[PDB]
């Protein structure tokens, strides 16, 4: 029954603690991605406001002229 149980405990701590570390590095890649995502969000929103403003600008220009 025993004998083998002694060695088996070691590996199911090592392999399953390297998992712990493997996890904390994933949560850190996660928060860095959420961060980067929100930046693109505000980037795009700043872009579309500028775009709409320029679309409106050309509209007014052609009317003032044609």
């Amino acid at each position, epitope marked *: 029954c025993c004998g083998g149980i002694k060695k088996e405990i070691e590996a199911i701590k090592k392999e399953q603690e390297a998992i712990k570390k493997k996890i904390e590095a994933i949560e850190k890649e996660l928060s860095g991605i959420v961060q980067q995502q929100n930046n693109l969000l505000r980037a795009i929103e700043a872009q579309q406001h500028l775009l709409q403003l320029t679309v409106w600008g050309i509209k*007014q220009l052609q*009317a003032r002229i044609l």
Partner: antibody
Amino acid sequence: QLVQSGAEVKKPGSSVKVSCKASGGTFNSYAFSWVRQAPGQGLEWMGSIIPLFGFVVYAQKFQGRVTITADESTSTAYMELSSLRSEDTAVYYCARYFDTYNNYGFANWGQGTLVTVSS
Amino acid sequence: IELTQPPSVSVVPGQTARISCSGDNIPYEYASWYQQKPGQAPVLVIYGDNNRPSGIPERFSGSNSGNTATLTISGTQAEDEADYYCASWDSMTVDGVFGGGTKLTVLG
């Protein structure tokens, strides 16, 4: 946000410049328009400037007499009506729009400017 | 382009009020509704589709069918008595154009 210059009295034939200093954000992402309201009547859209591009569109009843200008260094848009007659006696509003991208409505208004044309 | 409003509209409190805005081609999202109590500057209440600026009561609704836009007010209160204007932009000249205005008179 918006605050315009004080009330004024102009002799028939004179000119008048109305200021409107905006505050609370990037001035180049603004769109402006000048709306006036004669005593007792409705609103009348006169012109519209986009400070970023530095030119104006005018309602054709006002073409020639009215001049609109912004000033990014002072965060202020200007309205100037020339060759004044008593039918120009009204409260003149500074009105900004494009609060958001799809908002074509005038979101913010100034307090108004009572211009009285009298000899 | 032009916009026609009824000069005056009157309704009993608690019941809904409808103000029509008739014009040829009133683009789509270019439309707006404003509220103007006596000695004040107008207040944007609805813009474009059916959007209330954050701060405007949920009883204000915006609608469009054919050539007519319509501001709707569910359960009209006595403090809604004011001059209501509609406005838009010309799709051709990019001219801003206001309606004549509608005096809302809450009865009772």
